[PDB]
Nucleic acid binder design. Structure first.
Ligand SMILES: Nc1c(C(=O)NCc2ccc(F)cc2F)c(=O)n(O)c2ncc(CCCCCCO)cc12
Ligand SMILES: Nc1c(C(=O)NCc2ccc(F)cc2F)c(=O)n(O)c2ncc(CCCCCCO)cc12
Ligand SMILES: [Mg+2]
Ligand SMILES: [Mg+2]
Ligand SMILES: [Mg+2]
Ligand SMILES: [Mg+2]
Ligand SMILES: [Zn+2]
Ligand SMILES: [Zn+2]
Ligand SMILES: [Zn+2]
Ligand SMILES: [Zn+2]
Lengths: 66, 261, 47, 242, 261, 47, 66, 242
DNA sequence: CGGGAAAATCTCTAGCA
DNA sequence: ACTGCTAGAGATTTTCCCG
DNA sequence: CGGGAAAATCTCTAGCA
DNA sequence: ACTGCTAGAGATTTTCCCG
């Protein structure tokens, strides 16, 4: 009953940015969402983004895949 | 060398040579000539070639007053989505700004307002309205519009759309609301291929859904983690990495240097 | 410690040096002549 | 996919779920589950209601999202067609307004409001709006003493109604309810767009007769033929237009 | 599809949707929605995201008038080297500009002068001075300062150096000539690690030396080349490639598809 | 042949279409209403 | 007597630019110099640059090598 | 390199060329050829001359590069120290002026000219300048009728003298001669900078005694020991400072 | 697997006082 | 202790679509 | 061949009306 | 048919310098 909510929270995509890179990195996989940080998985790399550097969406072109 | 240091300092006090000129003319290494330049107070005239990055949390809006046709348009943008609201106000005062902000806070979940240091936004009236609605005011650095770089850009885009619909309306406020319609619902692009209205609905619904999902996950999972140290809190585990939080610092460890309880 | 030369308020004249109270991602907080100022890092040089 | 489709269709034969439950439970694409729920014979978010209420000798335009109870009220200087059309243009630019249901007054049947509703693409129609009017007037009577003008009190009551009053099933506010309803409508519109995108493709598989396309992946092609859903590999299938 | 084309055109005449919005809302491919946008005259509001590249031949200078302390400084730059000349002139007229330009043409080999469309440079007086000295005038596109992007940049740099030496001089013209000294001889960098004076001497001496060397090479080498065609002129040959010139087009061929006579 | 929409002379108002007489590296020469103008390619869109 | 002048003309270095690249390419080797074009050799590639896009210098830090 | 050094030194023993001919002929670095020409016992571009000439009741400052004949003349409004210092600051910012040779007049011995020459780093000293003055006055008398003011005629004569009069050995103008002379001076200064850069290195080779460094390549190190020049490989050599 | 075709992504600019 | 961005235009790279 | 050290190169910005 | 650039500040990559 727990694993379904974890797979549900990994269905959300994150568009994030690094510290001196002005370009938005692509849709990562939301692993964890906190009050001040967001743990993502981008290109098999587990990153910790600040909350102020991430845009988390459930892209509603999920009606093809995901 | 050292004679070159003395002569190079004495000529930098005249000509203000750069490090390359003093390194060539006085046989100095680049470290010494760079130190001769870096000690002159008159030569520090350039800053860092970087830009910052604005806050794009789901609750922060950016507000600015722009001017068109002798009238004042107060514009707000949702920074995470690009959703704008805009209204032609009769004057650029604190009463009109506080009314616009209380109205916007009643419409959407506004948690933070980022403005420049315009008198409209700096007033006690907007301060009382943000205190009533529970909004946090975050003023930018004075005379630095790049801190408001979202809303200023949206000012540009808003004026562009007004120039495409100005002949469709008799008054300016009608053209402003028509441009707000066109930006929020008739322009697509950005991170999801969305319009700004679809994107703000996705941002806010995702914030609600992920907040309640993480509240349901955190309530069940209670696993004390000993990494490499002390007892942390487990945030996530998947098959090769474990993300934890020990003393308010969120860290990632491999399955080596980890053990969960 | 650090010397900060900065660009304050619609003035092309650079000024300093000042003490670096806080270096952040994007901006700095400095103290020049017991005046605490927040400067963007584009308008500041730290030595 | 071949595991999930038979499970979902027999589950629909069992107790007739909708396609969202099937797309969540059996990892189906929503078009496949939509075709599962659409092959059984036995198996609103853009409607707003507008009125003008009168309080303290002034006129308040009130627009209620009927599906949510979300409210947008505004003190207008006159109950005319120009102010109504300006309020409607603001509302249509703020939210996805598809139909506006009014009470056949004099300011809602204006040529100005008709031109505004034509421009924004809104249909006009002539115990939800007066219930919300009474609840909003109750909040205005509560927080009138915290403001000097009636405009401020109306916007304060709209804030309190949309975000500080929680009721219903799960104890949500009207703002959370409207963003859930509009997100569900965006999902429904994207699904209908994708279904409309793939209905003009006919496939030939293994040949055999023409079948409808439902899903085209990176290795598999999910088709529907003779009202049963099959999964063929991509190279055994020819997808053409019609 | 085609019904979508009709409805998308009729909504683009209202809302001026971009191609992404009409491609999503009316099931159009990107080609059709892009053609609906590209036919609206009201939607062509952005140019090409490029920049040009100024002429940097060894004979072209770029001139501009800048203003400092209520006085006018006429500045010229050698575009290939960055060597500047500058003078505080009493007025921004054509007589002072023609005097400055005749003086500069007497000092250095000036072959082309590139200016903006200031009245100083557009006058008949500067036109007669450039006719006398044999200089070609190349005015930029009006109200486009990027065409003069070298000299405008040098204006910036010149003012910077004046702000470092303004307390060393009592008059502005002394500080201007001190800054010209410091730029031409006390600042090093750029393509050879040179100062601007060393670089202009290298540019012009290289132009003289390579011109006379190529005149000596071209006089000896006379080899008719048949490539792949007709008789070309041999420009260069080295061990795997042959550079030729047939009908004023300089081409490079390999040793395959070539034969020299 | 080609349509050119351009930005002429300290005016934010874009105007056109015009015939493309000459496309160069960096700028274009166009003809709008029998007026031959030279526009930078940053201030011109060619279709 | 001819080859010495060819090796002399190849001692000059060219800093050139391409059509839409704003950055200056490094010191190529001057093979040929014309009235309107310049034939260079950069990274074992024979290029033809316009005259208005090239800066030809004999870098006087030739007192180490070349 | 080992082929070239013995050839160049025996060629210097034969007919005593300078280092530029050796660095061109035998593909030597200029420091090695400079040490070849510097081990034989038996083996100006910054000097300008200033004067004031008087013509049509006006004063013309004339500065001649002595090595080239290149001229810079300017009609000044007064024969004072301020105008002389302004002319000298312009000339020093335009060309590499190292020494200025004047005629011990009243405007060349001023405190203002002394301060200007101190700032720009110019030494002052008290049949070249009057020869060029007579030639320049001849050109001014030629082209006076093509101008209205005397300033224009002086700048026209300076143009004609520097670029339209060709004489000397190869038939060059004064502008070509001054850019050749200043390019040769830049080469001489860069060579002296590199020699000064490597004189504080001593090397130990194959050990054996301390030798002077002349050239350090990517595989070879050229040294000089006991007044003969050797070439050792890099790994057989230890280069240290002293 | 392989060439065009098409989509996606990268690069870069003006304008926002 | 706070912070450039956005959308469009063209170039370029990646993916697709059947052979 | 290999780690620091240093040099060279890449990236990016303001200011030039 | 004409055209953004320049110099400095910091980051990053390449070369050097002996073990
Ligand atoms: N200069 C203002 C701009 C402005 O220059 N934009 C252009 C602009 C320039 C660069 C950029 F990167 C983004 C931009 F947009 C702008 O857009 N707005 O809104 C402003 N609003 C208020 C005040 C006055 C500040 C009050 C005094 C503070 C005392 O502490 C100034 C401005
Ligand atoms: N605007 C002028 C600027 C100028 O904006 N610089 C700033 C500037 C801006 C952007 C840039 F990328 C480089 C720059 F430098 C400048 O520098 N100079 O010199 C000018 N000189 C003369 C005239 C007036 C033109 C006469 C009317 C033409 C009628 O046909 C205008 C200007
Ligand atoms: Mg503002
Ligand atoms: Mg603004
Ligand atoms: Mg100008
Ligand atoms: Mg200018
Ligand atoms: Zn200094
Ligand atoms: Zn059923
Ligand atoms: Zn349009
Ligand atoms: Zn000798």
């Amino acid at each position: 009953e727990l694993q379904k909510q974890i797979t549900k929270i990994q269905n959300f995509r994150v568009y994030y940015r690094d510290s001196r890179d002005p370009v938005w990195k692509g849709p990562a996989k939301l692993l964890w969402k906190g009050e001040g940080a967001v743990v993502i998985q981008d290109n098999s790399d587990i990153k910790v983004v600040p909350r102020r550097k991430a845009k988390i969406i459930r892209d509603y072109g999920k009606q093809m895949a995901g | 060398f050292l004679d070159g240091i003395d002569k190079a300092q004495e000529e930098h006090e005249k000509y203000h040579s750069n490090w390359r000129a003093m390194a060539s003319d006085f046989n100095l290494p680049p470290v010494v000539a760079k130190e001769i330049v870096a000690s002159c107070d008159k030569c520090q005239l350039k800053g860092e070639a970087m830009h910052g990055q604005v806050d794009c949390s789901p609750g922060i809006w950016q507000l600015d007053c722009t001017h068109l046709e002798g009238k004042v348009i107060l514009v707000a943008v949702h920074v995470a989505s690009g959703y704008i609201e805009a209204e032609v106000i009769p004057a650029e005062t604190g009463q009109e700004t506080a009314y616009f902000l209380l109205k916007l806070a009643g419409r959407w979940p506004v948690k933070t307002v980022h403005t420049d240091n315009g008198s409209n936004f700096t007033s006690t009236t907007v301060k009382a309205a943000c205190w009533w609605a529970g909004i946090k005011q975050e003023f930018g650095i004075p005379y630095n519009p790049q801190s408001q770089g979202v809303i200023e850009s949206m000012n540009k885009e808003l004026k562009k759309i007004i120039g495409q619909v100005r002949d469709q309306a008799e008054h300016l406020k009608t053209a402003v609301q028509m441009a707000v319609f066109i930006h929020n619902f008739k322009r697509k692009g950005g991170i999801g291929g969305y319009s700004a209205g679809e994107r703000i609905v996705d941002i806010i619904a995702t914030d609600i859904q992920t907040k309640e999902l993480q509240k349901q996950i955190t309530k069940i999972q209670n696993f004390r983690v000993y990494y490499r140290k002390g007892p942390a809190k487990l945030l996530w585990k998947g098959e090769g990495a474990v993300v934890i939080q020990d003393n308010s610092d969120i860290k990632v460890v491999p399955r080596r240097k980890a053990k969960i309880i | 410690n650090f010397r900060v030369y900065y660009r304050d308020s619609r003035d092309p004249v650079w000024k300093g040096p000042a003490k670096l109270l806080w270096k952040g991602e994007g901006a700095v907080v400095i103290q020049d002549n017991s005046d605490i100022k927040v400067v963007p890092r584009r308008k500041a040089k730290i030595i």
